[PDB]
Amino acid sequence: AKTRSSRAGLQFPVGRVHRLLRKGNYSERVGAGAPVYLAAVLEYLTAEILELAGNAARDNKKTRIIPRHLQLAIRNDEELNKLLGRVTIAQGGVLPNIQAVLLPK
Amino acid sequence: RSSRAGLQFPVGRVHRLLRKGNYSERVGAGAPVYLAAVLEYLTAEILELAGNAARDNKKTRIIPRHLQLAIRNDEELNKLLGRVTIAQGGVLPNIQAVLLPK
Amino acid sequence: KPHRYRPGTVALREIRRYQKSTELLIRKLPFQRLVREIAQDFKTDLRFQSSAVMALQEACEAYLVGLFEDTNLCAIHAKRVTIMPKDIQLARRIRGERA
Amino acid sequence: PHRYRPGTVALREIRRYQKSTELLIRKLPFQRLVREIAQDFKTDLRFQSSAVMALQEACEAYLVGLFEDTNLCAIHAKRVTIMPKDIQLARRIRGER
Amino acid sequence: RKVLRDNIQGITKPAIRRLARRGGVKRISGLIYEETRGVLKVFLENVIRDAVTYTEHAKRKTVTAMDVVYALKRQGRTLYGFGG
Amino acid sequence: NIQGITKPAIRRLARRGGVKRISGLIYEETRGVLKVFLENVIRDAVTYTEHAKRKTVTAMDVVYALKRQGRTLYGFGG
Amino acid sequence: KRSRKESYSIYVYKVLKQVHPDTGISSKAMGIMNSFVNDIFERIAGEASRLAHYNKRSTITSREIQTAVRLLLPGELAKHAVSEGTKAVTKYTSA
Amino acid sequence: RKESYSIYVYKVLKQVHPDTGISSKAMGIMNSFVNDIFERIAGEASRLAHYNKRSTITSREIQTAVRLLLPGELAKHAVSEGTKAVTKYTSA
DNA sequence: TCAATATCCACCTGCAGATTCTACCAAAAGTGTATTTGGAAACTGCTCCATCAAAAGGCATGTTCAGCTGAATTCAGCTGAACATGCCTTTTGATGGAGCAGTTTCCAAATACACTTTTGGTAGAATCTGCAGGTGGATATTGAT
DNA sequence: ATCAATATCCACCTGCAGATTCTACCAAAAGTGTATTTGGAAACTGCTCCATCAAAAGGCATGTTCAGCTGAATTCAGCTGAACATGCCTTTTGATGGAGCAGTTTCCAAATACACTTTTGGTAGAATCTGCAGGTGGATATTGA
Ligand SMILES: [Mn+2]
């Protein structure tokens, strides 16, 4: 009954992750905690983006997160912006920004 | 084996590096061979151009600057190593015309 | 009158309008066509998954919008406000797209 | 009194330095900088002689590239004197800042 | 079917301007449009070429969305939203 | 400690870069960039060190760190 | 005659509901998040993969995943990650 | 212990230029070049195999990996020598 | 150009620090046999893709007009290159000692493995419902008097 | 200092394309008994890595001058945005034919697993050398009159 995920108190599939590691050819063998450790990092990171996205969708008056929100989220938090610096988000658009000089006198 | 494939580069050495490299479950028989030759070839490609670079400066011993001068002058190799930095290589002689007198 | 917005008023209006949204700016068909033309020149008799094309377009358009910013910055840098091919050329060089 | 016009040496210095490959930054001040920095991350650290050479070759070689790009930036604005702003542009476009 | 030709022109100027506005540009020189098509054709070719190469390797006649996503990956331009 | 990177050296580096005339503020700016570079390359290097339980930072540690930064270096695998 | 393709939607959704009980996520949105997890997963596992080799050690222990995080993740993101990762593992073992 | 390609590089340097010789550092660069390329070709082939749900890196993978990895001409010649070396291995 | 500087540059030359060649042992690479199996050939169901048809209204084009930008210039304050000085901080060269990477050698704990249960997820139908598309005043913002 | 002229803002409405749910099967974790390894933990090496010590020699730091470069102002042709009228062709929706992905099987040609036999390639001396490092002497390229 104790799915490895529940033992770690994680929401992500710890077993799923363990397997991907084995079949990914990252190493001949995988420790018993790695998948748990990593599964938690993907959870945290995921939870981190939803946190800022959900809000972005709140500001906009929407109850459903769309990509755009996701974009606004990642490009406004310095760190995520960098972690996903070479990442392109389909249907994301870009942060509103107009060079000062351009504006009217 | 390498001698069988008519190459200098070690087909076995490579086959060993591939299997133990985590690249995939199993390595086909001709893979290590093919790759080896591609590894040799490329080398020859750089040496021949650097070699010339040597004689080009009245030397007979290829050093770093000889490679860089051979790598950054060829468009293709330059592209292939465009994110590579050769230690002790220096830059190619270049001065913007706007900086010139007159 | 006739009412005439001064040059730059509508340009900024657009800049604000097109940044607040996320719809593709190139028309879907001409792009498709363009893609197929180019792909046909690499291997005849190819079939494209409807989305494979959306991808290319999602990327191409993101790429160019991204190029224009760096472009626009170079013009600003040369005191100008009009982006010119010259600006684009510098932006790509610096970038490493074609040193 | 023989005086070289201003800017004549520069070209001669460019021709000089581009023709060579030796490192430019003085080794000791550098190695010092290395150790100092690394200590902000770890204590009782020992750089194996070559490690510090790897860093210098790397570091110096980077700065040069940046300067080549900063030139074009300075040139692009019709100037000919690399300014700090030019370096900033160059780095911004590069994806560093 | 039909003969595809000069379709890099399908990329209308109004659009290029649009792409530029989203970019932040407020004043576009006239020589810009032909320049842009130039870069776009080159960017596209590379992304497509690579893509099609992944296609051929899987001995398939269809260009899948993943073939594009992997291509973009090699090119560094990582894309999210089309193939997990 | 960083001020050890003497102004004359920086000019030499810029000289190789094809630079002809150098502003005065540059020098400070260059030290900042230069510092951030090393700060980033070593941090990843020492991390690689620590993980190997070592106390001595070998060259391969710098090489690996220079690769993550996309600043690959040749000739130091020896 | 089926073809079950897996994803993280179930998990991405369980998490969205912990942070925003009233918020939801559309199709595309989910697909974006699915990519993000996969990418990140590939980066972490890839880096770890390289550390074990740089050290001639045939196995990827969680200790490698952690350095992979530190090297891969920037700033606080890393701190909280490393933190969150440990909590899960120490607990898991005591299970 | 602690190997390299030093030996070979030199054998190849002798074929193209019997009269010339290579420095230590230069030979060190050349030795770094081999590894990187090797690393790229392998890593790439490695992925093609994965994308295609196949657990074995064949020479066909190394090849496709080469077309993706190497630019213009280098790619062509690199493919030939690769295909040329394989045939001779299978012949005898 | 003429001339009076300073600067490079080949033309040769002499030893020492790298180079390259030798001379011999372990770690691999290559063999021989017995095992496993991965994916090429061979169908074959069925999504998905290529195509054709029609209507229409969202836009791409083209031509005017002229606002205000960019490019050409003019002009002089002052930043920063060329220099000749005076000094100290870098080079280097051992020499010695000692923290420390690197090796071996037992092995306890941690993994891998091969089955056998037992769910947790994914692939559809069945229910909901944000909000995409429009509608209209209420606001600003702009540009002309 | 005003006032039309418009484009943008927000809140409100309401059905339906796009989520949310609700159920069944089953590919995949999970639970356990075995069959290996793995990578520490002590033990010691020979490293290489700091540490002083101690001179000279560039190479750095300064204070002077003033060449000419970077900025600030003008000026004006004309490049490019804002508009408006035209009517083209991109969009939308549906409907099919069928090319060609993929899901299953069938099975050798091929890669892996041991357990040995032979040879190659890395090391550390041993026997060469290429370039460095200085030296003239004479064009070269600058620069003042
Ligand atoms: Mn064609």
Residue numbers in the entry:
A (entry chain C): 14 to 118
B (entry chain G): 17 to 118
C (entry chain E): 37 to 135
D (entry chain A): 38 to 134
E (entry chain F): 19 to 102
F (entry chain B): 25 to 102
G (entry chain D): 30 to 124
H (entry chain H): 33 to 124
Sentences from the paper on this structure:
The basic unit of chromatin is the nucleosome core particle, which contains 145–147 base pairs of DNA. The DNA binds on the surface of the histone octamer, composed of two copies of the four core histones, H2A, H2B, H3, and H4. On the other hand, the N-terminal tails of the four core histones and the C-terminal tail of histone H2A protrude from the nucleosome core particle. In the present study, we determined the crystal structures of four nucleosomes lacking the N-terminal tail of one of the histones, H2A, H2B, H3, and H4.
